[PDB]
């Protein structure tokens, strides 16, 4: 993965 | 004059020492082992990798998650990791064997952020399902689910004795929680409500550092509810970027940024004191070694590497 876009 | 002397440095001199290649998608988070020996990295490629903290040497790959991983965190004794995944689980890992000891099930959307308490009998989680969960390490069971926020939870962190949890969220709020009861002890949204992208207690547990998706870091005295310092100059409007207190030498604030740089600020003066150049995509995560003046930095899809930087103070 959600943090990596 | 013949008596002129080199003044004492007021800025760090971090310089690139190693570049760590191996992940095949964006890196999501880097964390140094408490014992200083290891760096763990999480990635969208569903893997955790372990690297020597001083030599950048690849050590092992840890696998089992079925989707990408947004966060990883060490236990106090450097023997366990916990990881937070898009597959809606957290997993507890034995580092030496690489085996998954426990799968933590209960979140109904991506698990985004993770941390052990200092005692390392508890894990705290934050999710896109807008909940914070607290888990028993030995049983892998969910002890409490907190209705923490009204949008995805971006960060979750215990204070230095584990009595408090701080959480951040896209709903614009920072909240402090009583570990023992799950009760909310404080809500900060002192002024406007841009998404809070990251938050963390200061090492002494009396302040919180919070990032907001408006190109700003703020140091907060949470007992007073006042903003003590503001740090600007970087770019952060999109991603949940980790920030750090660097305490091994000079007292800095360290963060990644969406202009592919690592930013270093003087904690007291708010002056940008260094910008580390090298990455080729957003620096999503940075971490500071527990005893040596070493920074790890990690970057997204057009980079996929970790970098180790070292300074003299």
Curated annotation (Swiss-Prot), chain B:
The record marks 86, 112, 242, 301 as: Important for interaction with histone H3. There is a cross-link at residues 6, 25 (Glycyl lysine isopeptide (Lys-Gly) (interchain with G-Cter in SUMO2)). It holds the Pfam family Beta-prop_WDR5. This is WD repeat-containing protein 5. WD repeats lie at residues 22-61, 64-105, 107-147, 148-187, 191-232, 235-275, 278-312. GO terms for cellular component: ATAC complex; histone acetyltransferase complex; histone methyltransferase complex; mitotic spindle; MLL1 complex; MLL1/2 complex; MLL3/4 complex; NSL complex. GO terms for molecular function: histone binding; histone H3K4 methyltransferase activity; histone H3K4me1 reader activity; histone H3Q5ser reader activity. Belongs to the WD repeat WDR5/wds family. Changing residue 112 to D: Strongly reduced affinity for histone H3. Its main location: nucleus. Changing residue 187 to M: Found in a patient with childhood apraxia of speech; uncertain significance. GO terms for biological process: gluconeogenesis; negative regulation of transcription by RNA polymerase II; positive regulation of DNA-templated transcription; positive regulation of gluconeogenesis; regulation of cell cycle; regulation of cell division; regulation of DNA-templated transcription; regulation of embryonic development. The modification N6-acetyllysine is found at residue 91. Changing residue 112 to L: Strongly reduced affinity for histone H3. It comes from Homo sapiens. Changing residue 204 to A: Loss of interaction with RBBP5 and reduced ability to stimulate KMT2A methyltransferase activity in association with RBBP5 and ASH2L. Keywords: Acetylation, Chromatin regulator, Host-virus interaction, Isopeptide bond, Nucleus, Repeat, Transcription, Transcription regulation, Ubl conjugation, WD repeat. It is found in: Nucleus. Contributes to histone modification. May position the N-terminus of histone H3 for efficient trimethylation at 'Lys-4'. As part of the MLL1/MLL complex it is involved in methylation and dimethylation at 'Lys-4' of histone H3. H3 'Lys-4' methylation represents a specific tag for epigenetic transcriptional activation. As part of the NSL complex it may be involved in acetylation of nucleosomal histone H4 on several lysine residues. May regulate osteoblasts differentiation. Changing residue 128 to A: Significant decrease in interaction with KMT2A.
């Amino acid at each position: 993965x959600x943090r990596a876009x | 004059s013949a008596t002129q002397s080199k003044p004492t440095p007021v800025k760090p001199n971090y310089a690139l020492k190693f570049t760590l290649a191996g992940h095949t998608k964006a890196v999501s988070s880097v964390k140094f082992s408490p014992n200083g020996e290891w760096l763990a990295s999480s990635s969208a490629d569903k893997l955790i990798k372990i690297w020597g903290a001083y030599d950048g040497k690849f050590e092992k790959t840890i696998s089992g998650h079925k989707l990408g991983i947004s966060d990883v965190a060490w236990s106090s004794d450097s023997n366990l990791l916990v990881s937070a995944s898009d597959d809606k689980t957290l997993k507890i890992w034995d580092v030496s064997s690489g085996k998954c000891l426990k799968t933590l099930k209960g979140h109904s959307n991506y698990v985004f952020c993770c941390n052990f308490n200092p005692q390392s009998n508890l894990i705290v989680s934050g999710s896109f399902d807008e909940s914070v969960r607290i888990w028993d390490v030995k049983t892998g069971k969910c002890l409490k689910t907190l209705p923490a926020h009204s949008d995805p939870v971006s960060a979750v962190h215990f204070n230095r004795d584990g009595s408090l949890i701080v959480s951040s969220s896209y709903d614009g709020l920072c909240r402090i929680w009583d570990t023992a009861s799950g009760q909310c002890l404080k809500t900060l949204i002192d002024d406007d409500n841009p998404p809070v992208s990251f938050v963390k207690f200061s090492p002494n547990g009396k302040y919180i550092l919070a990032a907001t998706l408006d190109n700003t870091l703020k140091l907060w005295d949470y007992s007073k509810g006042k903003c003590l310092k503001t740090y600007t100059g970087h770019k952060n409007e999109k991603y949940c970027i980790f920030a750090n207190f660097s305490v091994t030498g000079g007292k800095w604030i360290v963060s990644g940024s969406e202009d592919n740089l690592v930013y270093i600020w003087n904690l007291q003066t708010k002056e940008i004191v260094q910008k580390l150049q090298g990455h080729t995509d957003v620096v999503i995560s940075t971490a500071c070694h527990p005893t040596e003046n070493i920074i790890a930095s990690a970057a997204l899809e057009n980079d996929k590497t970790i970098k180790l930087w070292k300074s003299d103070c």
